Amino acid sequence: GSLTEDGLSYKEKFVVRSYEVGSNKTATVETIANLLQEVGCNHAQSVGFSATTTTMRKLHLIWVTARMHIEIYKYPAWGDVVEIETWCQSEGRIGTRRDWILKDSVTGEVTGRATSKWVMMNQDTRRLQKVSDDVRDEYLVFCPQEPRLAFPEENNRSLKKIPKLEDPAQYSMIGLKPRRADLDMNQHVNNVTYIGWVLESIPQEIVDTHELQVITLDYRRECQQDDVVDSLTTTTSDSQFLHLLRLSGDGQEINRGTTLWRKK
Amino acid sequence: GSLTEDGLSYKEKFVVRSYEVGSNKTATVETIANLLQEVGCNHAQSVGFSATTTTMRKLHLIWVTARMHIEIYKYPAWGDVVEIETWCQSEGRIGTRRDWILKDSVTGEVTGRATSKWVMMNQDTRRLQKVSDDVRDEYLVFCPQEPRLAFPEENNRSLKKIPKLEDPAQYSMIGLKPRRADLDMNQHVNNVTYIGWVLESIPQEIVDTHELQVITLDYRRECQQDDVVDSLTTTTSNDSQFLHLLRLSGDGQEINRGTTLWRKK
Ligand SMILES: COc1ccccc1-c1nnc(N)o1
Ligand SMILES: COc1ccccc1-c1nnc(N)o1
Numbered sequence: 001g002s003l004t005e006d007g008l009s010y011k012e013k014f015v016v017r018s019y020e021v022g023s024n025k026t027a028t029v030e031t032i033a034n035l036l037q038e039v040g041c042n043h044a045q046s047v048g049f050s051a052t053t054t055t056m057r058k059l060h061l062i063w064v065t066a067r068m069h070i071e072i073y074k075y076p077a078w079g080d081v082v083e084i085e086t087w088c089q090s091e092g093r094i095g096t097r098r099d100w101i102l103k104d105s106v107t108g109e110v111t112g113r114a115t116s117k118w119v120m121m122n123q124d125t126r127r128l129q130k131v132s133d134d135v136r137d138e139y140l141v142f143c144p145q146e147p148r149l150a151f152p153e154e155n156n157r158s159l160k161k162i163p164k165l166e167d168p169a170q171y172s173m174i175g176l177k178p179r180r181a182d183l184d185m186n187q188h189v190n191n192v193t194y195i196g197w198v199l200e201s202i203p204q205e206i207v208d209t210h211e212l213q214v215i216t217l218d219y220r221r222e223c224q225q226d227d228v229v230d231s232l233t234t235t236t237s238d239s240q241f242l243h244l245l246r247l248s249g250d251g252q253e254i255n256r257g258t259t260l261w262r263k264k
Numbered sequence: 265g266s267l268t269e270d271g272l273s274y275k276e277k278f279v280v281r282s283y284e285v286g287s288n289k290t291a292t293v294e295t296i297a298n299l300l301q302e303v304g305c306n307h308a309q310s311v312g313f314s315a316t317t318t319t320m321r322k323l324h325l326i327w328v329t330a331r332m333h334i335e336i337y338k339y340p341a342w343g344d345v346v347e348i349e350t351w352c353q354s355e356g357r358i359g360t361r362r363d364w365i366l367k368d369s370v371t372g373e374v375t376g377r378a379t380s381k382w383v384m385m386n387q388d389t390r391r392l393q394k395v396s397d398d399v400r401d402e403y404l405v406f407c408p409q410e411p412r413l414a415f416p417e418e419n420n421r422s423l424k425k426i427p428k429l430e431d432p433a434q435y436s437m438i439g440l441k442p443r444r445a446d447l448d449m450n451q452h453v454n455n456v457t458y459i460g461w462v463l464e465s466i467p468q469e470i471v472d473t474h475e476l477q478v479i480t481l482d483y484r485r486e487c488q489q490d491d492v493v494d495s496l497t498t499t500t501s502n503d504s505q506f507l508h509l510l511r512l513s514g515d516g517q518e519i520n521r522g523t524t525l526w527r528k529k
Contacts, residue, residue: 018305019298019456021449030445034283041282045343078449079309175439180471181294181460185285185342192283196445207444 001042008144009087010043013105016076026075027082029199029212033070033192036100036114039084047142055135056120063096063118065191069151069158069216072112074104081105089143093130095119096139099150113150115158162218162256165244169232173200175248176229189223194255198243201233202259210239210261217257223247229254238262265306272408273351274307277369280340290339291346293463293476297334297456300364300378303348317402320384325393327360327382329455333415333422333480338368338375345369353407357394359383360403363414377414379422426482426521429509433496437464439513440493453487458520462508465497466524474504474526481522487512493519503527 001012020031027035044051051063076082085101095118102112120129151158182193195217223229228248236242238260245255265276284295308315315327340346349365359382366376384393415422446457459481487493492513500507503525510520 017298017302019301019448019454022444022447023449023451025449028445034281037283038281175441176443177439179440179460179464180286181292183286184283185287185289187287190283196443200443 001039001046003043003046004085007047008142009085010039010046011083011085012039012042013081013083014038016078016080016082018078021078023208024075024211026077028075029070029072029215030192030196032072032075032102032112032114033068033195034190035082035084036070036086037190037192039086039100040098043086043088053135053138055132055138059135060123061120061129061135062123064121065116065219066095066119067117067158067216067218068114068191068195069116069214070112070114071151071157071214072102072212074111075211076104076111082111087144087148088139089148090131090136090140091117093132093136095131099148101150115150157214157216157260160216160258162216162258163242164253164256165232165234165242169201169244170234171201171203172233173197173231176200176231177227178223178225183225187225189225191219194219194223194245197229197231197245198233198255198257198259201231201243202241206239206261210263212259213238213262214260215257217243217255219255221252221254223254265303265310267307267310268349271311272406273349274303274310275347275349276303276306277345277347278302280342280344280346282342285342287472288339288475290341292339293334293336293479294456294460296336296339296366296376296378297332297459299346299348300334300350301454301456303350303364304362307350307352311406315403317399319396319398319402324387325384325399326387328385329380329483330359330383331381331422331480331482332378332455332459333380333478334376334378335415335421335478336366336376336476339475340366340368340375346375351408351412352403353412354395354400354404355381357396357400359395363412365414379414421478421480421525424480424523426480426523427507428518428521429496429498429507433465433509434498435465435467436497437461437495440464440495441491442487442489447489451489453489455483458483458487458510461493461495461510462497462520462522462524465495465508466506470504470526474528476524477503477527478525479522481508481520483520485517485519487519 022028083103083105089097098116100114178189184190232244234242241259243257286292347367347369353361362380364378440461442453448454496509498507506524508522
């Protein structure tokens with residue numbers, strides 16, 4: 001991988017692995033989400049991060065994902081090379097945004113796109129906060145100054161408000177628990193695990209006859225390594241679904257989202 | 265990746281990813297096991313497969329893993345390049361064996377080794393069988409004729425008989441279920457998922473103060489996508505050794521048995 005000529009974006013090529021594909025012999029949406037995370041990490045390392053800046057480490061502040069939105073036109077097949085371009089942008093004091101463009105390396109055609117919203121949080125108290133003047137000036141030198149959006153369209157799917165699924169759910173998958181492979185290097189549940197858990201309550205008949213086109217996921221609270229999650233889904237319609245992940249006991253919300261599926 | 269000069273082994277380099285590492289910023293044993301599976305698949309494709317031979321496809325026969333044995337001296341760190349060499353060998357009519365050597369690409373030093381035993385099974389009936397001459401002759405042109413062993417030694421750990429854990433287990437992790445990410449392209453539970461499930465019953469204190477050195481896992485029966493598994497562990501021992509058992513949550517039917525050896529950090 002490498003930064004582009006202007007040093008304001010990053011590109012990396014990936015060869016899709018045998019264990020990374022589903023029954024259609026193409027990359028799962030979890031594989032795509034892990035590759036997005038990987039190219040984002042390689043971008044941060046390339047621009048000097050040990051994505052916490054000097055003032056952030058001093059104040060015990062970190063970036064946390066508030067929303068992930070992914071749209072796939074074509075899933076890359078096993079053995080195919082996919083090229084991903086990523087960049088970050090300042091969203092004033094609200095937070096930051098990371099965008100991605102996925103392309104088929106052979107044809108150069110856009111096969112997917114993603115966007116994510118990140119907020120600032122104190123790592124010890126878990127208290128969200130606005131982005132200060134000091135932390136913003138030290139990361140603006142790594143972002144394009146003019147807007148560069150993966151989802152330019154005014155009022156597009158990436159910015160839609162998501163409602164809360166009301167009981168009873170049409171479908172459910174109960175008692176989901178993370179294992180050590182689901183954790184990251186900081187012993188926290190990887191954000192991609194939550195996408196998998198959301199997808200667990202979609203019926204197998206939908207998965208067998210449809211391809212996932214769009215997924216929007218809001219992150220409200222973390223699952224601890226000793227928590228148990230229930231995944232709920234209701235059809236709201238192409239086929240569209242509303243999703244809810246909540247703790248198995250008290251029913252505390254951890255995520256809400258929507259998926260759009262196209263008939264094969 | 266590419267076949268070596270003689271066309272009897274295959275090599276591939278991998279850059280360790282951010283999501284592939286644990287708390288020590290080095291590759292988990294599940295990442296290593298997935299890379300072993302990936303280099304094995306790339307080797308089969310490079311020698312003409314799509315690893316079923318023409319006679320196997322005609323008789324609805326497939327290779328299935330009976331045992332996996334992995335020894336790691338050094339886990340590669342995040343961003344490091346690891347090079348893996350793999351090859352297959354005929355074990356007469358019993359089955360086949362796939363071996364691997366892992367090396368640090370920068371130093372050229374051996375950081376790990378693995379070996380696996382595969383048996384022939386009818387895809388539809390699940391009945392194990394010996395390897396016929398017609399099948400053996402079709403794959404021998406892709407294997408070294410003289411023995412090449414990742415674990416040459418006389419009394420080596422890869423061939424040790426594993427006992428059955430007796431109740432009560434010292435530790436346990438109950439109600440483990442596979443999700444769609446745990447399945448392969450054929451909708452079967454990936455063999456690496458079983459390694460993760462075995463490791464779930466090891467106490468977090470062992471994981472925090474020790475590094476996994478050796479793991480031997482026997483595969484007896486597969487977990488269906490609607491089955492539920494219990495993972496059991498008992499200490500059998502500077503070094504810590506454990507005996508493992510994975511069984512179905514209901515009837516207690518065995519699916520795997522294994523052993524792990526851990527050295528203090
Ligand atoms: C690596 O992430 C963390 C580290 C420390 C404290 C919290 C987190 C976190 N991740 N997601 C949320 N909501 O908090
Ligand atoms: C892809 O694997 C299969 C396909 C068809 C039938 C059985 C298997 C299998 N894999 N492991 C065992 N024990 O059976």
